[PDB]
Amino acid sequence: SLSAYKTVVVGTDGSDSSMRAVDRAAQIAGADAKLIIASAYLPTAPIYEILHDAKERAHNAGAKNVEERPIVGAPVDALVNLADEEKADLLVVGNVGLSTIAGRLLGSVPANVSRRAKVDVLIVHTT
Amino acid sequence: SLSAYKTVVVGTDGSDSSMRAVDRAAQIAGADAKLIIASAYLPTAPIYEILHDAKERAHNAGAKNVEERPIVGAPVDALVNLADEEKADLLVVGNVGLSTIAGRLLGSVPANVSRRAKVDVLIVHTT
Amino acid sequence: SLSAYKTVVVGTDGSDSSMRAVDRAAQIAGADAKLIIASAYLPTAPIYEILHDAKERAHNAGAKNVEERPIVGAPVDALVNLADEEKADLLVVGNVGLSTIAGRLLGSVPANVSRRAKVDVLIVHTT
Amino acid sequence: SLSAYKTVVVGTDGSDSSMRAVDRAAQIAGADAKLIIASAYLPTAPIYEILHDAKERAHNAGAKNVEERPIVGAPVDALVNLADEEKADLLVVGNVGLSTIAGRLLGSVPANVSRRAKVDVLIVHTT
């Protein structure tokens, strides 16, 4: 008798593939959940334009409670910290990878399956 | 303009973790989506009792169009095969892993982040 | 003109796969390199017997300079710390995994290939 | 007991990263082992030139028995096939990855640890 996701965080770097993850995250967050869009600062900084556009796409997709957020430093650690400070219950990202031997050999199976079967993959954490 | 998922496939082994994944999967499939519950066969077989209970769990969660299906041979290839044959647009599994050096060192980052942040992780496929 | 590995760290939980990784790590360390054998502490603690035996097997494999080390807390973070503290140049682990749908879906590709092609995999870091 | 590797394979795309992995693979191949350099085809031919540059770097690294070999189709499967056809006992790749939120979140832990500790990672298969 679980409840719907209340705090969704989605990462975007502005790529077209990335925007699809934003849309899906928007559809899930809807009008009752909080949607946080994040982007890693690799280098007004250009990231803010990416966040703004992403925030607009989210609104057009149905997300009413949207906010942007730059990620600083080692992205994954920052993301985990964000999830904890915002008590996120769902994290979303768009699949991506390299078509080279190394790029593929060093990947993760979930990302691989997602690409192989052109499907989305959901990992449910355990208490 | 994104609509909800139509064909949701979830994996389970009968453990507690798997049941949470089933709940979440059911909650998403709801009533207007097809929910296929899969389980890997690895020695009527006891797997059918697990699939039956999971099926009832999916029902007690809101899933209507529920159906069970045993996974045979290499589970990933089978799963990829099942999704392609059923036009699935969402695969779901409960997180799981080993806590030994090798167990943790050989895993995937999404699995790891899911555990560290006690949050679910969604990988959205691209074109 | 890259030279041979000088400081090798291998992890073991005392299983048979792990012991094979110990033999391989020992074969690489030989008589001119330092071999550090690590094991994650989960719970004289039983971990010391496992370490002692691993040390014995390393010697019988030609490794002259071998020391044991218990790993505490989150395993990967402890391993990264050890590698930094001992200036390691090669980490070794025996492949391992779960055979359930989730176990396989959440794994890494390098571990998958290792099992698929029954071969050892080596990831070379970059600057 | 165990003996050094006899058939070593190493993928490369010509990148600086790949070249470092070539050097390491060659250092291991030495003179009494065969080094098979591989490169994905279609991720006087661009791929053949890369393979040429690799054979030369390998030779200088101390590799005696070297041989170029283009990979066709999905790199991983081809690599797995190549491994079995050549009965390779070791695969080598240069660590590579994306720095975006998705890029790091979707990677594998072995690749990640290799980057964090700037160390090489070896996964020993079981039997």
Swiss-Prot record, chains A, B, C, D:
<dbReference type="Pfam" id="PF00582">
    <property type="entry name" value="Usp"/>
</dbReference>
<dbReference type="InterPro" id="IPR006015">
    <property type="entry name" value="Universal_stress_UspA"/>
</dbReference>
<dbReference type="GO" id="GO:0005886">
    <property type="term" value="C:plasma membrane"/>
</dbReference>
<dbReference type="InterPro" id="IPR006016">
    <property type="entry name" value="UspA"/>
</dbReference>
<dbReference type="GO" id="GO:0046677">
    <property type="term" value="P:response to antibiotic"/>
</dbReference>
<dbReference type="GO" id="GO:0006950">
    <property type="term" value="P:response to stress"/>
</dbReference>
<dbReference type="GO" id="GO:0009274">
    <property type="term" value="C:peptidoglycan-based cell wall"/>
</dbReference>
<comment type="similarity">
    <text>Belongs to the universal stress protein A family.</text>
</comment>
<dbReference type="InterPro" id="IPR014729">
    <property type="entry name" value="Rossmann-like_a/b/a_fold"/>
</dbReference>
<protein>
    <recommendedName>
        <fullName>Universal stress protein Rv1636</fullName>
    </recommendedName>
</protein>
